[PDB]
Design a binder for this molecule. Structure first.
Ligand code: HEM
Ligand SMILES: COc1cccc(OC)c1O
Length: 402
């Protein structure tokens, strides 16, 4: 596009380090715009992301690097009857009434277990010592991966993150860094080595684990879903479902530390934690630009005539800084009005795990502030955020008087 010639000089590294400056230009200049290094149109404003995600003239598509990472049928990348079946597969344990029966007994002992390892130290790095472990241990136990250690689940989602976001394409539209998928292939091979025996056992001996229910629920007598049919959704879980609740927790904490009067309010009044988290997700969206839709008919959007078959990446993290919608969106503010946000997406492909995720983050922050009410951020350690497809703080050093 002529007036966006400057986009040809945007780099993958620039977007990973801090996408907000480029996307501030995009929201003003071109809410729907082809980004050469990404090889795709991207939607950057709230109105366009919401329109594309809910439009009857669009359906899900996996991003190019997403397809190389997850293959088929990834729940995020399919539609029609397959999507309907995969949604019916994952939804039972995620139903709000079901989550409310057991979420507290799942997450709160886990949060306590990780807290007891450092709560008397006076210093911690909360991303690696608390947020990521609670997130992966909670989901891992729900899925049936009790025996897979939290360090391993963390390693897997980091490798899958890097593979899914290995998006750079060169002048010819080919992947610029094909070698960057090798780590994802290696993660998937390890995952298979660990998970295949569990599937073998669940096929014959179903139990209460969520993956056993993926094999068996809704199937005729003695039949199970083929493992090749469910594995891409297992991988999808082992990236975002494992990664995002820890990142949303951590970003919420960074935001509250940026507004010390608000941190104090939340510590004194934990009923404010859910509002704190919602603002945290808007302020640094954990799934920032990981998913996409493709047009099924010609459409006109934000002044652009798109042919049928055109992918559009949904940069929800940018939409959540839309200044048409928010005042001073780059500032964390607990008392912002409770406007809709797009950090869980929208439409038939919106997040299936919202209620579960919100409770995991809530219970983790409740127990953190009960154990360490006098938490303070270590201000010499700058909080670095990293990532374009998925974004969060790389570490969160904190201190407190023991
Ligand atoms: C704070 C944590 C989380 C955030 C911010 C988040 C956000 C998202 C987003 C942005 C998408 C894509 C939506 C779209 O393209 O419109 C998504 C999809 C999805 N998420 Fe969540 N997620 C979180 C945690 C979880 C967890 C813990 C689970 C599972 C227990 C989960 C299950 C899913 C599923 C199954 C999908 C695909 C839905 C589909 O394509 O039909 N999420 N999530
Ligand atoms: C691109 O990868 C993903 C996108 C959205 C949700 C995911 O996990 C639930 C996920 O793993």
């Amino acid at each position: 596009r002529p007036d966006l010639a400057w986009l040809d000089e945007v780099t993958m590294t620039q977007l990973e380090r801090n996408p907000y400056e480029v996307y501030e230009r995009l929201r003003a200049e071109a809410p729907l715009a082809f980004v050469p290094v990404l090889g795709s149109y991207v939607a950057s404003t709230a109105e366009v992301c919401r329109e594309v995600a809910t439009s009857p003239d669009f359906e899900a598509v996996i991003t190019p690097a997403g397809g190389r990472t997850f293959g088929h049928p990834a729940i995020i990348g399919v539609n029609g009857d397959i999507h309907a079946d995969l949604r019916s597969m994952v939804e039972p344990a995620l139903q709000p009434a079901e989550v409310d029966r057991w979420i507290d007994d799942l997450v709160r002992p886990i949060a306590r277990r990780y807290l007891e390892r450092f709560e008397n130290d006076g210093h911690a790095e909360l991303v690696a010592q608390y947020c990521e472990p609670v997130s992966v241990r909670s989901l891992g136990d729900l899925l049936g991966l009790q025996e897979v250690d939290s360090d391993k689940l963390r390693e897997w989602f980091a490798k899958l993150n890097r593979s899914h976001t290995n998006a750079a394409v060169d002048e010819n539209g080919e992947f610029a860094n094909p070698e960057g998928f090798a780590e994802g292939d290696q993660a998937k091979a390890e995952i298979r080595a660990v998970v295949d025996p569990l599937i073998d056992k669940w096929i014959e001996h179903p139990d209460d684990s969520a993956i056993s229910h993926w094999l068996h629920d809704g199937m005729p007598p003695g039949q199970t879903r083929d493992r090749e049919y469910i594995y891409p959704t297992i991988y999808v879980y082992l990236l975002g479902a494992m990664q995002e609740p820890g990142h949303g927790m951590a970003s919420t904490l960074v935001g509250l530390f940026s507004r010390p009067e608000q941190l104090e309010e939340v510590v004194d009044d934990p009923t404010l934690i859910p509002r704190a988290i919602a603002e945290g997700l808007r302020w640094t969206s954990p799934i920032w630009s990981a998913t996409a839709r493709i047009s099924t008919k010609p459409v006109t959007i934000a002044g652009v005539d798109l042919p049928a078959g055109t992918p559009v990446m949904l940069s929800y993290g940018s939409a959540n800084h839309d200044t048409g919608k928010y005042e001073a969106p780059s500032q964390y503010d607990l008392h912002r009005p409770p406007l809709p946000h797009l950090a869980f997406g929208a439409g038939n492909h919106a997040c299936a795990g919202i209620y579960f995720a919100n409770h995991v983050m809530r219970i983790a922050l409740e127990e953190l502030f009960e154990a360490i009410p006098n938490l303070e951020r270590d201000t010499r350690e700058g909080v670095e955020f990293w990532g374009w497809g998925f974004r969060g703080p790389t570490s969160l050093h904190v201190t407190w008087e023991v």
